[PDB]
Design a protein around this ligand. Sequence first.
Ligand SMILES: C[C@H](C[C@H](N)C(=O)[O-])C(=O)O
Length: 257
Amino acid sequence: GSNRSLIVTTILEEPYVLFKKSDKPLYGNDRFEGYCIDLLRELSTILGFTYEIRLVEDGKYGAQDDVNGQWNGMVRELIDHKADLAVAPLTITYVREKVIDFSKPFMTLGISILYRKGTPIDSADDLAKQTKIEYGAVEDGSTMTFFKKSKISTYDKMWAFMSSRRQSVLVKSSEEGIQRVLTSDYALLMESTTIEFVTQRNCNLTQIGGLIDSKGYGVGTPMGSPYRDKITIAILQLQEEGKLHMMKEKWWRGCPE
Ligand SMILES: C[C@H](C[C@H](N)C(=O)[O-])C(=O)O
């Protein structure tokens, strides 16, 4: 028979992946749009594959359980060969590299702070030393894991805060985190890429301070997948010819800065 379609896991996160609005019902792959959907399209034509997009069943990016070491999210879907690729804003980190493979990065970012304007707050240190303004991150994503494992004094203190208040400050999605910033005294620890999108849509919101780390998003594959190196080559081509730059400008398109 013919070559089977690759199963591609991904996750809803604007402007990387969203449900396309339309007047008539959309089915299958047609339901989705965004930067990572355009990226997937390019990879499919460059490499020559067909695909089926499936949103990660548990709704998570992926983190490790303390007791049994098991992963969840898109990372686990790859480990168990439930997906061939993860094409998503999936952060490349060493602990993830121990269990899945990544392409070279298609976008760079660092953690920063999303908050409201008109406060004196200027850095993570300003949050860490107090408990009136709450703060948190998306549960079972790389930002949460960054704080959970960091030995940096400020970040360790911030994790102590988040851990004891997990149910109230760790959030199910970035969208929910943004809602917390709009509806309570709350600052979200969010990746800088995503903050740039959010603050250009909502002129009430701003980034606080700079980037506290530096890393990239990559396409994930199960360990040993032959697709990983081929996808790296494709990403480099897309980068060199200006396509990734154009794609970012398209999806990131107020507000004064
Ligand atoms: C939402 C985001 C997910 C993050 N890009 C990851 O790959 O786990 C975060 O943790 O801030």
